[PDB]
Design a protein around this motif. Structure first.
Motif, short mmCIF file in Angstrom:
data_model
loop_
_atom_site.label_atom_id
_atom_site.label_comp_id
_atom_site.label_asym_id
_atom_site.label_seq_id
_atom_site.Cartn_x
_atom_site.Cartn_y
_atom_site.Cartn_z
N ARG A 11 113.76 139.09 40.14
CA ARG A 11 113.72 140.55 39.56
C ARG A 11 115.20 140.58 38.97
O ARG A 11 115.34 141.21 38.05
CB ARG A 11 113.54 141.50 40.64
N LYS A 12 116.02 140.13 39.59
CA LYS A 12 117.47 139.97 39.20
C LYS A 12 117.85 138.99 38.29
O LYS A 12 118.42 139.39 37.38
CB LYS A 12 118.10 139.70 40.48
N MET A 13 117.24 137.91 38.44
CA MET A 13 117.43 136.69 37.29
C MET A 13 117.24 137.04 35.89
O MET A 13 117.76 136.69 35.05
CB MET A 13 116.53 135.65 37.83
N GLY A 47 123.64 139.32 26.76
CA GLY A 47 122.43 139.94 27.49
C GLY A 47 121.80 138.93 28.52
O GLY A 47 121.23 139.53 29.39
N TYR A 48 122.00 137.58 28.46
CA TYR A 48 121.37 136.54 29.45
C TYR A 48 121.73 137.28 30.80
O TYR A 48 122.80 137.72 31.11
CB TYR A 48 121.78 135.38 29.17
N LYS A 49 120.71 137.09 31.65
CA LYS A 49 121.21 137.53 33.00
C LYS A 49 121.17 136.22 34.22
O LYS A 49 121.24 136.68 35.46
CB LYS A 49 120.13 138.65 33.76
N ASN A 50 120.76 135.08 33.34
CA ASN A 50 120.95 134.00 34.51
C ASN A 50 121.16 132.87 33.60
O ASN A 50 121.11 132.92 32.20
CB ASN A 50 119.55 133.57 35.21
N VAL A 51 121.87 131.71 34.10
CA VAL A 51 122.36 130.81 33.44
C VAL A 51 121.72 129.35 34.29
O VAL A 51 122.46 129.14 35.34
CB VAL A 51 123.83 130.55 33.13
N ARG A 52 120.96 128.53 33.75
CA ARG A 52 120.60 127.30 34.67
C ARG A 52 121.65 126.15 33.75
O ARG A 52 121.68 126.33 32.88
CB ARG A 52 119.25 127.22 34.17
N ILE A 53 122.03 125.62 34.64
CA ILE A 53 123.03 124.40 34.70
C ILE A 53 122.37 122.99 34.97
O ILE A 53 122.44 122.65 36.17
CB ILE A 53 124.25 124.63 35.15
N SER A 84 130.30 130.86 36.08
CA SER A 84 129.00 131.57 35.90
C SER A 84 128.90 132.61 36.75
O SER A 84 128.55 133.73 36.62
CB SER A 84 127.93 130.64 35.85
N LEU A 85 129.18 132.48 38.10
CA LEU A 85 129.10 133.35 39.27
C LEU A 85 129.95 134.32 39.16
O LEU A 85 129.75 135.58 39.43
CB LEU A 85 129.19 132.54 40.61
N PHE A 89 126.33 136.08 36.94
CA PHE A 89 125.12 135.58 36.60
C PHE A 89 124.37 134.93 37.81
O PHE A 89 125.20 134.25 38.47
CB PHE A 89 125.10 134.34 35.47
N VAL A 90 122.97 134.85 37.91
CA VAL A 90 122.22 134.35 38.84
C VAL A 90 122.30 132.81 38.36
O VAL A 90 121.99 132.69 37.36
CB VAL A 90 120.84 134.72 39.06
N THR A 91 122.96 131.97 39.08
CA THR A 91 123.30 130.58 38.69
C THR A 91 122.42 129.57 39.04
O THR A 91 122.44 129.77 40.42
CB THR A 91 124.72 130.17 38.72
#
Ligand SMILES: OC[C@H]1O[C@@H](O[C@H]2[C@H](O)[C@@H](O)[C@H](O)O[C@@H]2CO)[C@H](O)[C@@H](O)[C@@H]1O
Length: 304
Positions: A11-13, A47-53, A84-85, A89-91
């Motif tokens: 929900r956070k991501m 606006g992104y709320k998460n970043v996948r690396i 990121s953290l 951002f949920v990373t």
């Protein structure tokens, strides 16, 4: 004992982005531009709320026992994660393109374990917002028994040093013809399931001419609805790590598609990251221009 549960996280991501073709390249930079701390300032403004690396460990890890990971490379990945953290951002970090593990398994599973052993250790004290994604695309070139074996053992390794950190294991995949979901899921309270587009017979299809039609949309809601039922029945939240990973008939279709996926996904309570190639000029699937620090406004608009 009481940490954030997977459902709260999903929900956070929310809607996020991928730092594509960067650390998962053979060597950072050999593909798209390297990670810069301003990338994250812009993603946050965007606006992104998460970043996948994505991250390919293959060439920063010895090919022989004890399969140690370059001290420097680990330092580097942590630097990016912290950027990121620190931005809220949920990373998500993972193993991407480390195909060697699929070209053998009996032979390389230990190397794969050592790598995950060292990742878990180094990041053990990281914020709850850092998630471990065992392997990018588990399906294909490896039996189901092995895919299951892998998750159990890497999860087990992770849990020794990260008792409550949420882990992401593939829940299944989908394509124009069918959807496949996992039945056998590990007994653990901190897991998120992820799906990606996958077609084992991809290199055979007589093809169509890329995505965007109404029929394709009909196809996705279908898929999304089944994953939904899967999610509810198994009590495991869903995350589409990298979507809109296809080529499109035209600019208007592409925009529409980004607008469509985002809607359907978030309405069903899914978390997702858009795939960002980080490439302009071919032009492929890049939303953020790492050189101009500008985004394709229309797309961002369609995602939010
Ligand atoms: O394999 C090299 C190829 O990767 C492309 O990104 C993949 C991504 O790695 C995968 O996880 C996701 O499911 O699909 C995307 C796109 O297909 C990248 O875009 C290419 O430029 C690169 O040559």
């Amino acid at each position: 004992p009481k940490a954030v549960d997977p459902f709260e996280m999903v929900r956070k991501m929310g809607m996020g982005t991928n730092l594509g073709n960067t650390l998962e390249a053979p060597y950072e930079g050999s593909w798209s531009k390297s990670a810069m701390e301003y990338y994250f300032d812009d993603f946050k403004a965007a606006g992104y709320k998460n970043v996948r690396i994505p991250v390919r460990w293959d060439n920063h890890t010895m090919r022989t026992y004890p399969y140690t990971i370059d001290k420097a490379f680990l330092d580097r990945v942590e630097q990016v994660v912290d950027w990121s953290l620190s931005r809220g951002f949920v990373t998500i970090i993972n193993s991407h393109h480390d195909d060697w593990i699929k070209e053998d398994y009996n032979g390389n599973i230990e190397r794969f374990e050592k790598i995950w052993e060292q990742i878990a250790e180094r990041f053990k004290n990281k914020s709850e917002n850092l998630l471990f994604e065992i392997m990018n695309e588990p399906f294909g070139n490896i039996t189901d028994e092995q895919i299951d074996d892998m998750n159990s053992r890497i999860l087990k390794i992770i849990r020794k040093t990260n008792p409550t950190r949420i882990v992401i294991i593939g829940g299944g995949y989908w394509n124009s013809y069918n959807t496949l979901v996992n039945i056998k899921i590990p007994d653990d309270p901190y897991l998120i399931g992820t799906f990606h587009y996958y077609d084992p017979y991809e290199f055979t299809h007589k093809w169509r001419g890329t995505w965007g039609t109404q029929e394709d949309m009909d196809t996705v809601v279908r898929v999304f609805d089944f994953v939904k039922s899967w999610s509810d029945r198994n009590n495991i939240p869903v995350y589409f790590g990298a979507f809109a990973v296809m080529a499109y008939a035209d600019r208007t279709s592409r925009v529409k598609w980004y607008d469509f996926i985002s809607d359907a996904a978030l309405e069903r309570g899914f978390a997702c990251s858009v795939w960002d190639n980080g490439v302009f000029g071919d032009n492929d699937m890049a939303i953020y221009n790492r050189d101009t620090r500008t985004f394709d406004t229309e797309i961002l608009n369609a995602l939010f």
